[PDB]
Design a protein around this ligand. Structure first.
Ligand code: HEM
Ligand SMILES: CC[C@@H]1C[C@@H]2C[C@@H]3[C@H]4C/C=C\C(=O)NCCC[C@@H]5NC(=O)/C(=C(O)/C=C/[C@@H]4C[C@H](O)[C@H]3[C@@H]2[C@H]1C)C5=O
Ligand code: NA
Length: 390
């Protein structure tokens, strides 16, 4: 009988069972759904799973995907493909997410952040940082990039939640798909009649004018970006703020030394266990060795990125949040599926800390920290609410 995964923990806890496993051979676990899998936890092994071509993201051998969600994760977008099919589809978005394009969005990201903090301050201390900033700012940023109007934001929140809830069924997923495809269908029509200079329009051109992708792939790319592109940073904005506010000096190191904000963001990315479960398993495509075990063809290995980011040999005193630490974390993944949004996410999180430190240097929890309400059945770790006071 096998060890169950994911492991017990609450909030942003990193549980001690990892300290035991780092010292042992690769371990097989049973998951909430699908087949058993091995647990890659060493930094080098997680990197291997995510970037070696002997690890496929596609269950091409009849596997039942190891997962935390009742309905298997399947579709026609970026997580459904290996190179080189993956690489050809991504390259349609590629140019829109390089550092040279994303650095152009700093001003806008700050403008929205400032508008969020204006409404939060207007509401009065103590106020929920989740509802006033973590949710609205990242939603606006990607919805404006794509071309979705503010009145429609709530629809994408709903669709993204269904993907990210562990009690979602195949039927729940069929409903999301029908709702979403209808909505994108309207957007595709609108832009065929009236083209626009946004990301929907870019995909509509790539489908219709240059024949680079098909309609199903244009829909899939849109779906991936609007599913991944804002619930992510939302959770992280509140997780990062909560980590800072739980330390005795709170925001003061970054008030005093604003230039260290990019480094803090990186350390927080390394430290925060953002996933409550785990991402896509990969499947070995030939027999290979990993941490003393022969992984046979077809068997699954889960890349545990939170465990990689606390590898005891890569990161001395890995549990310590040291905003000045300086090896590259796996918090945006690695290899082919490394986060297309990574630079946008860095920009959003940097800007948020700039805004928070410049405007509320004495930010503090607005409730006792033991009263913090951490989410329970979500794909990600985070707060239902984050009351802050100034
Ligand atoms: C703090 C915020 C974020 C974190 C921690 C994060 C983390 C990750 C990680 C670890 C993966 C790889 C998962 C795997 O290989 O199994 C990934 C993939 C992806 N992320 Fe991000 N991400 C964030 C924000 C964003 C944003 C802002 C976008 C906006 C477009 C985005 C879009 C995507 C997409 C489309 C993929 C799939 C890439 C591919 O398969 O080619 N993410 N993210
Ligand atoms: C902040 C953490 C980041 C946020 C990112 C959002 C990512 C999740 C969402 C990413 C894409 C998406 O939802 N695209 C549309 C559906 C297509 C297809 N069908 C599914 O049922 C499915 C998933 O169900 C994916 C779950 C991802 C799993 C992945 O692990 C998450 C990333 C996660 C590691 C599919 O991909
Ligand atoms: Na820095």
């Amino acid at each position: 009988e096998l060890l169950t995964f994911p492991f017990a923990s609450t909030g942003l806890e990193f549980p001690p069972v990892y300290h035991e496993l780092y010292q042992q051979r690769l371990t097989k676990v049973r998951l909430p759904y699908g087949d058993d899998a091995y647990l890659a936890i060493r930094y080098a092994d997680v990197k291997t799973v995510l970037s070696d071509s002997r690890f496929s993201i596609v269950a091409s051998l009849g596997q039942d995907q190891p997962r935390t969600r009742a309905g298997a994760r399947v579709g026609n977008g970026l997580f459904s493909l290996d190179p080189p099919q993956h690489s050809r589809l991504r390259s349609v978005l590629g140019r829109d997410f390089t550092p040279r394009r994303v650095e152009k969005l700093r001003e806008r990201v700050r403008e929205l952040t400032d508008q969020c903090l204006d409404r939060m301050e207007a509401a009065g201390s103590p106020a929920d940082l989740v509802a006033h900033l973590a949710v609205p700012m990242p939603t606006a940023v990607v919805c404006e990039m794509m071309g979705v109007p503010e009145p429609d934001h709530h629809l994408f929140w709903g669709w993204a939640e269904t993907i990210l809830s562990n009690d979602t069924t195949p039927d729940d997923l069929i409903r999301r798909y029908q709702e979403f495809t209808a909505y994108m269908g309207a957007m595709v029509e609108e832009r065929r009649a009236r083209p626009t200079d946004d990301m929907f329009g870019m995909l509509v051109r790539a489908c219709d004018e240059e024949g680079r992708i098909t309609e199903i792939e244009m829909h899939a790319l849109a779906s991936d970006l609007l599913s991944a592109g804002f619930v992510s940073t939302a959770h992280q904005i509140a997780n990062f703020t909560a980590m800072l506010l739980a330390r005795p000096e709170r925001l003061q190191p970054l008030v005093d030394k604003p230039e260290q904000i990019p480094a803090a963001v990186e350390e927080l990315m390394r430290h925060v266990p953002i996933l409550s479960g785990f991402s896509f398993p990969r499947y070995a495509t030939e027999d290979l060795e990993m941490s003393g075990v022969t992984v046979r063809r077809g068997e699954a290995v889960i890349p545990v990125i939170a465990a990689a980011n606390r590898d005891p040999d890569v990161y001395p005193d890995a549990g310590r949040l040291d905003l000045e630490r300086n090896l590259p974390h796996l918090g945006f993944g690695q290899g082919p599926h490394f986060c297309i949004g990574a630079h946008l996410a860095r920009v959003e999180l940097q800007v948020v800390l700039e805004a928070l430190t410049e405007r509320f240097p004495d930010l503090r929890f607005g409730i006792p920290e033991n009263a913090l309400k951490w989410k329970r059945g979500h794909f990600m770790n985070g707060l239902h609410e984050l009351p802050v006071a100034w």
